[PDB]
Structure formats: structure tokens, C-alpha cells
């Protein structure tokens, strides 16, 4: 079903995908193999279709998480880079491809959550949460505040919760245990009691969400935020003179930010297995490769270390590193769906007062 | 605080491998007389991992690390460093270094110590 002798890529909308057809044409010149880069509409949904039918692209490019269902179901190949090659990118990144003990895509770029701060209202932002109810009562006093992020979803609110102790599901050894979840133990406790907190003693809002913050930062009203690579942009066309950095800790220890990488998956159904492990490894997880994408749309941080040390002389790319090596990669597993709800309806509960902390979290538990 | 610990060297590692720790002690340090490493797994205990008695270079290691780590002084630089090989997933932690002049009980006993750095993390895939 799927043509034997060209390669069919498909990426989607929001990614360089202009810039990975400009490495499909260097695979050209040196091979004759014709590589079609794609950007097809609703590809999240698209690709499991077409490819439980033994149709679809020879390589997929997705988020790491949804390819462990992927690889369940049957639609994705077993990948076999050498020890070489596997070194040439860093350790906890090919954890994140991993499902059922075996290397199930190649990763690309790595993404998640950093400390964004305004560096005229706060040239020195603060290395722990513990600072933070001090540097707001000082920044209250001019009008200003000193943190706004969207506390609505738990993507945001589980770096500080599960800082000391919290995690989503057990990984050991290649293999998530959906029978041990750290949701309700002392570390998560103490995570939310301080977000909690916060919001008691009026450093924070219990109805700040994505935009409330967005705006509050972009117009020089709070001097810190938390968010992604992908709300860069819209703090360059504010003007404001922001820093990317660490999150702050908590007990001392990091807060742990869920990590997605963006990974590059072999279709089940390829003829072409061998060539396109030869245009992954050999092209596309190169410097060369990694820039002519980077070049169209911005990759943020990526697996591949000879070229992160390139793009890490931004340091808000170094920041998105440090703090994706800190943090927990999502799980890549359907019983986060569970995770999800059950973590939102906790905080909710907590941050408007209808539970107590440990009750929220002894249900989110269960 | 006039001494002032700083790690550095932490990251992520493969089983197997080895990975070198920092610390860079400043300030008045001329009385210091042990160095510790340890390790603290979020929510867990802090546990001793290496300690040197810098006045004769003898060392101490906890039994998961003999044999594998190493924990040596650099007096030309005032940096103590933690050499981690043969590295494994139960060795993922944040190392903390700490510092002191002289004390009553086990050098491997965080309450032995006085000076604490803020930690670098160490996190071993399988």
C-alpha cells in the first residue's frame, strides 16, 4: 500500500516543515530517493487511521506520548540505531521512546515548561518557591506582582505539586507501573499545600488561567510567568525584556515539569524501513539536518547533543533543557488520561477551598 | 556564610556510565577538615554517599557506592569532586556537598556537617 523506493513524511502544521523537506532534498542528492514531506490536516487523528490499515507515511512525526498507544496497536516499527548513534543523543531522551522494552521512534526536539521573568522588574528571579510570597509583598508595594501562571491545568500546577515526591505513574526499567501512583504521598502533599498557600495569602489567584496570565506578563504587570518555547513569540512582539530560566525549587529539589518530545516514527507498513532509518539517523539527526528545520520553525531544544550546544547559547534554550532534564517525561501510556482528570479536579477543589488538600488528593489518588 | 559550596556536573547519564561531580568550596576555608557527598531522592532521606578527611586523605563510602564512586580534593583549586562510574538507576538523586571543620559523629551522617552547596542532579536512565 505504502510505495516501495521514495520516502512519505508526514509532520504536522505547526512544525518546519518546509525546512525537513529541504533535508528530504539533500537525501535526494545524494541517494535518488524521492522524499515527500506532508503537513496533513488533523494528523493527530489521521495517522492511527490510515496506518491501522497498512497505508499512510513511511515516517511519522508526533509527540512522544501518543506513540506508546502507537506502538501498541501495532503501527509503529522497532528501531534499531546503533550504540554509536544512540550516544550521539541524550539518555533521557530515548527514554521517552521507549514502550514494551523496545526503542520505538527517534526523538528530535525536547519541550517543556520554564521560569519566564521580566528582568526590569526583577533583574535577580528567585532560585526556590520558598521566595516567593516575600518577592510578591515587595513587589505589591509598586503595583506590580511577582507570579501569574494558568492554574487551571495540571501541566502547569504538577512541576511545584510533585517537586518533593509526586509522580504520575511508577517507571522502572523501561515499564510503567498503572498500579503505583504517587498522586496522594508526602511529597504532592506538601507541593499542593504550598500552591495552596499561595493563593490564601493572595500571591496568587485560584482563577488565573492561560490568558489572565499571558496578558499580566506581556504588559509588565507580574514579574515572572511559567510557560513554553511555543509562548515566546508573543512576549518578542510585547517588548518586554524577559529572561528564560530554571524553575524554581521546592525543599530544595526540582520542580518537574512533564517533557514532550517530539520524536519520528517508522510506520509498521513501510517498504522503506531501511531508508528511512538511513534519513533519520544520517540526515535529519544531524547539525546540519536539525538547522535546516530549526531554520523554518524554531525546534526549541533538542535531543541531539552536538546541536543543542549550538542552540544552547540561547539561554532560553539551555533553560528549556535544564528544566526538560529536570522533569518527568509524560508517560506515554492511555491511563494519563485518568491522571489528568482526576489531578484537575483536585486542584480545583483545593484551590477553591471545597476540599482540604490531603481530602483532594486521597481522591485524585483512588 | 562565609564558605560558600557550589556543585556542578549533574545531568542526565546512561547505566553503565560515568559522570564527574563538582564542588567549589570559597570564603575561609582553611579550617575545613571533611567533605561529604551526599544524595536525596525527592521526599527521601538525605543519605551519606562519600566523605574525605582532607588533613590525611582517608575516605568513607556507603556500601550501595564503594567500589564504584570515588571522592577526591583538588587543594590547588579548593574543589572536591565526586567521580561516579559504572552508574545506576538507583543512583538518581540530587548530591548535595557539604562541609565542616571537625565533628562527633559519622563523617557520613548529614548532621555531621555544617556547610551545605544547593545540589546537582543526577538522573540515570536504565
Not at chain 1, 511577582?146 to 504520575?168: H, V
Not at chain 1, 510557560?227 to 530554571?246: C, E, F, L, M, R
Request: charged share 25%; aromatic share 12%.
Amino acid at each position: 500500500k505504502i510505495e516501495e523506493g521514495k520516502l512519505v513524511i508526514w509532520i504536522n502544521g505547526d512544525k518546519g516543515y518546509n525546512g525537513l523537506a529541504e533535508v528530504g532534498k539533500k537525501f535526494e542528492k545524494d541517494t535518488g530517493i524521492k522524499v515527500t514531506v506532508e503537513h496533513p490536516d488533523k494528523l493527530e487523528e489521521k495517522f492511527p487511521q490510515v496506518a491501522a490499515t497498512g497505508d499512510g507515511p513511511d515516517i511519522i512525526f508526533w509527540a512522544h506520548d501518543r506513540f506508546g498507544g502507537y506502538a501498541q496497536s501495532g503501527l509503529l516499527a522497532e528501531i534499531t540505531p546503533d550504540k554509536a548513534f544512540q550516544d550521539k543523543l541524550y539518555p533521557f531522551t530515548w527514554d521517552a521512546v521507549r514502550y514494551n522494552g523496545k526503542l520505538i521512534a527517534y526523538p528530535i526536539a525536547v519541550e517543556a515548561l520554564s521560569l519566564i521573568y521580566n528582568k526590569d522588574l526583577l533583574p535577580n528571579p528567585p532560585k526556590t518557591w520558598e521566595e516567593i510570597p516575600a518577592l510578591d509583598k515587595e513587589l505589591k508595594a509598586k503595583g506590580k506582582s511577582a507570579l501569574m501562571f494558568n492554574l487551571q491545568e495540571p501541566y502547569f500546577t504538577w512541576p511545584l505539586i510533585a517537586a518533593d515526591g509526586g509522580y504520575a505513574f511508577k517507571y522502572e526499567n523501561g515499564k510503567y507501573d498503572i498500579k503505583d501512583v504517587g498522586v496522594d504521598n508526602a511529597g504532592a502533599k506538601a507541593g499542593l499545600t504550598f500552591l495552596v498557600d499561595l493563593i490564601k495569602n493572595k500571591h496568587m489567584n485560584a482563577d488565573t488561567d492561560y490568558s489572565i496570565a499571558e496578558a499580566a506578563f506581556n504588559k509588565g504587570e507580574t514579574a515572572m510567568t511559567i510557560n513554553g518555547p511555543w509562548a515566546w513569540s508573543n512576549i518578542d512582539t510585547s517588548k518586554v525584556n524577559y529572561g528564560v530560566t530554571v524553575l524554581p525549587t521546592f525543599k530544595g529539589q526540582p520542580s518537574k515539569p512533564f517533557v514532550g518530545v517530539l520524536s519520528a516514527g517508522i510506520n509498521a507498513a513501510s517498504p522503506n524501513k531501511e531508508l528511512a532509518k538511513e534519513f533519520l539517523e544520517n540526515y535529519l539527526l544531524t547539525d546540519e539536518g536539525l538547522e535546516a528545520v530549526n531554520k523554518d520553525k524554531p525546534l526549541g531544544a533538542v535531543a541531539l547533543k552536538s546541536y543543542e550546544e549550538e542552540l544552547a547559547k540561547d539561554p532560553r534554550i539551555a533553560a528549556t533543557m535544564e528544566n526538560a532534564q529536570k522533569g518527568e517525561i509524560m508517560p506515554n501510556i492511555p491511563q494519563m488520561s485518568a491522571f489528568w482528570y482526576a489531578v484537575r479536579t483536585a486542584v480545583i477543589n483545593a484551590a477553591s477551598g471545597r476540599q482540604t488538600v490531603d481530602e483532594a488528593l486521597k481522591d485524585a489518588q483512588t | 556564610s562565609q564558605v560558600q559550596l557550589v556543585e556542578s556536573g549533574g545531568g542526565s547519564v546512561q547505566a553503565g556510565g560515568s559522570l564527574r561531580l563538582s564542588c567549589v568550596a570559597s570564603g575561609d576555608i582553611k579550617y575545613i577538615s571533611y567533605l561529604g557527598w551526599f544524595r536525596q531522592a525527592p521526599g527521601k532521606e538525605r543519605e551519606g554517599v562519600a566523605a574525605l578527611y582532607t588533613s590525611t586523605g582517608r575516605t568513607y563510602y556507603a556500601d550501595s557506592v564503594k567500589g564504584r564512586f570515588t571522592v577526591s580534593l583538588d587543594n590547588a583549586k579548593n574543589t572536591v569532586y565526586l567521580q561516579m562510574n559504572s552508574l545506576k538507576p538507583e543512583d538518581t538523586a540530587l548530591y548535595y556537598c557539604a562541609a565542616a571543620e571537625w565533628g562527633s559523629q559519622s563523617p557520613l551522617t548529614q548532621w555531621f556537617y555544617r556547610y551545605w552547596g544547593q545540589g546537582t542532579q543526577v538522573t540515570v536512565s536504565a
